[PDB]
């Protein structure tokens, strides 16, 4: 239920700021910069799963 | 929860990212489009 509470506002933010949505969407090969992007953004925001 | 609007930082070091084989996405009649290749 808190995975809901987490992920739903994750989606809220990702929707309202489409600019970085684009950058974490670019299908370049090595995700590592993008996983760093999203975790650097919201690691201290959420639970691990 | 919500970030402190520091997304611009996240993106600017996402490109602080700074092995480069772009992939063809479209092709036809002597014109191609290539994805990737951030430093061309």
From Swiss-Prot, chain B:
Recorded superkingdom: Bacteria
Q: Where in the cell is it found?
A: Cell membrane
Residue runs in coiled coils: none
Similarity comment: family membership:
Belongs to the ATPase alpha/beta chains family.
Tell me how this protein assembles. Answer: F-type ATPases have 2 components, CF(1) - the catalytic core - and CF(0) - the membrane proton channel. CF(1) has five subunits: alpha(3), beta(3), gamma(1), delta(1), epsilon(1). CF(0) has three main subunits: a(1), b(2) and c(9-12). The alpha and beta chains form an alternating ring which encloses part of the gamma chain. CF(1) is attached to CF(0) by a central stalk formed by the gamma and epsilon chains, while a peripheral stalk is formed by the delta and b chains.
Function in brief: Produces ATP from ADP in the presence of a proton gradient across the membrane. The alpha chain is a regulatory subunit.
- Indicate what this protein is called per its UniProt record: ATP synthase subunit alpha
Its gene? Answer: atpA
């Amino acid at each position: 239920t808190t995975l809901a509470g987490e992920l739903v506002s994750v989606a809220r933010l990702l929707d309202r700021e489409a600019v970085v949505t684009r950058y974490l969407t670019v299908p370049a090969e090595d995700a590592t910069p993008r996983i760093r992007l999203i975790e650097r953004l919201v690691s201290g925001k959420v639970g691990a799963p | 929860t919500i970030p402190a609007d520091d997304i611009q930082s996240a993106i600017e070091e996402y490109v602080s990212s700074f092995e480069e084989v772009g992939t063809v996405v479209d092709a036809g009649d002597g014109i191609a489009h290539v994805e990737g290749l951030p430093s061309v």
